[PDB]
Amino acid sequence: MFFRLTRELRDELKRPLGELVRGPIPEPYLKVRGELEKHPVVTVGDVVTENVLKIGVKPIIALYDLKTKRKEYSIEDTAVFLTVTNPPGTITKALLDTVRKAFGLAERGRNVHILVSGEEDLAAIPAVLYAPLGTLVLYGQPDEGVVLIKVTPECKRRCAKILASMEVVR
């Protein structure tokens, strides 16, 4: 029992959901480093995740493809790795549970890496739902730059509306 995009939503979400920060790797990352300093950070995408690490911020949660070409390097002590299956165009129950779990583990000062089989792109929705106010959520606008979401009451509503607008499949 899962949520699925509708044609309408698919088109709507083509456009940034927070502040788009324009430019090629790695400009947007250097432009936002200062803000990322100041708040907990969630990244969606292997490239986004990597590039936040490179500017010297540690995400409290990262979501990326299980099949990415990536490796551990000392981090890998208080770091937790969860897997979840999440097909293209869906937000599954498993994803919701995994993300919420991750926020739990972050409260106890663990950084969480969520390895997704399928697509992690929509994970930004639950990320906002479950995050403490003032958290920052980041994902990649391809060929444009990076989208920075600030978790506010306002934006918890929009993200809840998106879920409410999705098709529920039994």
Tokens of residue 5, six digits: 């995009």
Question: Technique behind this structure?
Answer: X-ray
38 in a labelled binding site: no
Q: Where do breaks (C to N over 2.5 Å) occur in the chain, by preceding residue number? A: 74
Tokens of residue 51, six digits: 């590039």
69 in a labelled binding site: no
Secondary structure element (H or E) that encloses residue 124, with its range: helix 124-130
Instruction: Give the end-to-end CA distance of the chain in Å, rounded to a whole number.
Output: 5
Measured CA to CA, the distance from residue 106 to residue 65 in angstroms comes to: 20
* Torsion sign across C-alpha atoms 126, 134, 31, 50: negative
121 in a labelled binding site: no
128 in a labelled binding site: no
Half-sphere exposure (Cβ direction) of 27: Cα atoms closer than 13 Å: 8
Q: Minimal CA–CA distance to 83: which of 61, 116, 39, 108?
A: 116
Measured CA to CA, the distance from residue 37 to residue 14 in angstroms comes to: 28
Measured CA to CA, the distance from residue 139 to residue 148 in angstroms comes to: 7
143 in a labelled binding site: yes
73 in a labelled binding site: no
29 in a labelled binding site: yes
Per-domain boundaries in the chain = 2-169
77 in a labelled binding site: no
Q: What is the DSSP letter of 132?
A: P
116 DSSP β-pair partners:
65, 84
Tokens of residue 159, six digits: 């993200």
Exposed e or buried b per residue across 19-44, where buried means at least 16 C-beta atoms within 10 angstroms of its C-beta: eebeeeeeebbebbeeebeebbbbbb
This structure's resolution (Å) is: 2.5
118 in a labelled binding site: no
Tokens of residue 115, six digits: 């390895």
> Are the CB atoms for 145 and 21 separated by under 8 Å?
yes
Q: Minimal CA–CA distance to 66: which of 112, 116, 139?
A: 116
C-alpha distance from residue 108 to each of 6, 18, 80 (Å): 37, 28, 12
> Are the CB atoms for 93 and 170 separated by under 8 Å?
no
Half-sphere exposure (Cβ direction) of 129: Cα atoms closer than 13 Å: 20
3-state secondary structure the chain: CEEECCHHHHHHCCCCCCEEEECCCCHHHHHHHHHHHCCCEEEECHHHHHHHHHCCCCCCEEEEECCCCCCCCCCCCCEEEEEEEECCCEECHHHHHHHHHHHHHHHCCCEEEEEEEECCHHHHHHHHHHCCCCCEEEEEECCCEEEEEECCHHHHHHHHHHHHHCEEEC
Give 107's contacts (C-beta < 8 A, 6+ positions apart).
Answer: none
> Are the CB atoms for 169 and 153 separated by under 8 Å?
no
